[PDB]
Amino acid sequence: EASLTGAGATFPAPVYAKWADTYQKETGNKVNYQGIGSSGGVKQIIANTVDFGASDAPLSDEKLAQEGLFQFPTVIGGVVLAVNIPGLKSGELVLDGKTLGDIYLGKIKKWDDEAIAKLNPGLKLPSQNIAVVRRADGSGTSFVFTSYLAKVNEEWKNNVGTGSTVKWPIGLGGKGNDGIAAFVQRLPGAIGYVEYCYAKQNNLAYTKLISADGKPVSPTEENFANAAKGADWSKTFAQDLTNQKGEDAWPITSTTFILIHKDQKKPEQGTEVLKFFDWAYKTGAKQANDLDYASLPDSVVEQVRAAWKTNIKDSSGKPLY
Numbered sequence: 001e002a003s004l005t006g007a008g009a010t011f012p013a014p015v016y017a018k019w020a021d022t023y024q025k026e027t028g029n030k031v032n033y034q035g036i037g038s039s040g041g042v043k044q045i046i047a048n049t050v051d052f053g054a055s056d057a058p059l060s061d062e063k064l065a066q067e068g069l070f071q072f073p074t075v076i077g078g079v080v081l082a083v084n085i086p087g088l089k090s091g092e093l094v095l096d097g098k099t100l101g102d103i104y105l106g107k108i109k110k111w112d113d114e115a116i117a118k119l120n121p122g123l124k125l126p127s128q129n130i131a132v133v134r135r136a137d138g139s140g141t142s143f144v145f146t147s148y149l150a151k152v153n154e155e156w157k158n159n160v161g162t163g164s165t166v167k168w169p170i171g172l173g174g175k176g177n178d179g180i181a182a183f184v185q186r187l188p189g190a191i192g193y194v195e196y197c198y199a200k201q202n203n204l205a206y207t208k209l210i211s212a213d214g215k216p217v218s219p220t221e222e223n224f225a226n227a228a229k230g231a232d233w234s235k236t237f238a239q240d241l242t243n244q245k246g247e248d249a250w251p252i253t254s255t256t257f258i259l260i261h262k263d264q265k266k267p268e269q270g271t272e273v274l275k276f277f278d279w280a281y282k283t284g285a286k287q288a289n290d291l292d293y294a295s296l297p298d299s300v301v302e303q304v305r306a307a308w309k310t311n312i313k314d315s316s317g318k319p320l321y
């Protein structure tokens with residue numbers, strides 16, 4: 001039985017917590033996971049304060065090589081816009097990229113704005129101020145979200161750009177996906193971007209969005225998977241899953257990654273970290289799907305296993321998988 005520590009992204013923390021609990025019940029191994037946000041996850045794995053870090057934003061091949069790190073994807077999730085609009089219900093409201101970017105720019109201030117009404121012709125929209133909510137902390141969900149906005153709103157692209165931290169034109173800061181969901185729950189008229197679980201968990205209404213191909217789509221586990229169906233995983237695990245073409249492709253989709261050292265200085269711990277994630281691939285898909293995360297295709301799991309064999313070693317050069 002090992003005691004493992006991980007830290008980082010809150011986007012997949014529900015499924016990592018479920019897998020940890022189930023794995024302790026079946027094997028006795030203990031996994032402690034701190035949801036501090038992807039930027040914190042990368043800092044802690046580089047500082048060696050944890051056995052594994054977690055980030056939704058992928059590190060480049062060069063940066064992994066500079067740091068002696070290896071990265072692998074675990075599950076596919078989706079970012080949704082959780083809203084608090086008395087009078088409307090979950091899924092009823094539709095937004096497109098351009099108008100969602102204009103809300104995040106602070107240009108559209110009311111829920112019954114003409115651009116929102118035109119997208120939603122049968123809906124009685126309230127004359128309520130929009131209360132924008134964004135992340136306070138360095139975040140892989142902000143990286144995904146601002147990567148998407150830069151594709152669909154040129155003003156956003158050219159003035160704010162993409163990052164795990166950006167200069168938000170407007171919006172209150174919430175800490176973690178949990179913090180944004182709490183903000184949205186307490187503020188009439190709020191909008192906040194969160195991984196899907198956090199909207200569903202908190203009984204918050206979420207919007208539909210327009211796909212890259214121009215059709216309204218609902219956020220579901222299958223529609224997150226759909227957004228990855230064109231990903232050529234054989235080329236790289238760092239796949240962009242925002243604004244992807246195809247039927248029912250949720251436009252703000254992302255996978256998420258675990259970071260470990262290639263040279264493991266506590267090799268028994270490294271061996272156990274690999275056994276935990278291998279167990280999750282083998283037996284954990286139902287738990288990920290129960291929490292509305294799509295599983296990676298079996299071919300990607302085989303890619304990860306094969307790369308574990310060639311990249312993860314102890315200080316004597318022997319493989320830990």
Ligand SMILES: CCN(CC)c1ccc2cc(C(=O)N/C=C\N3C(=O)CCC3=O)c(=O)oc2c1
Nearest residue numbers: 010013014017033034035197198200201291292
């Ligand atoms: C660091 C570990 N953290 C931090 C965020 C955890 C741990 C457990 C949970 C459980 C949740 C939860 O059980 N939701 C109720 C069900 N649920 C959904 O409907 C989808 C995912 C999900 O978990 C959650 O939303 O966030 C979590 C977050």
Ligand SMILES: O=P([O-])(O)O
Nearest residue numbers: 010011038140141
């Ligand atoms: O997953 P986050 O917490 O880095 O957004």
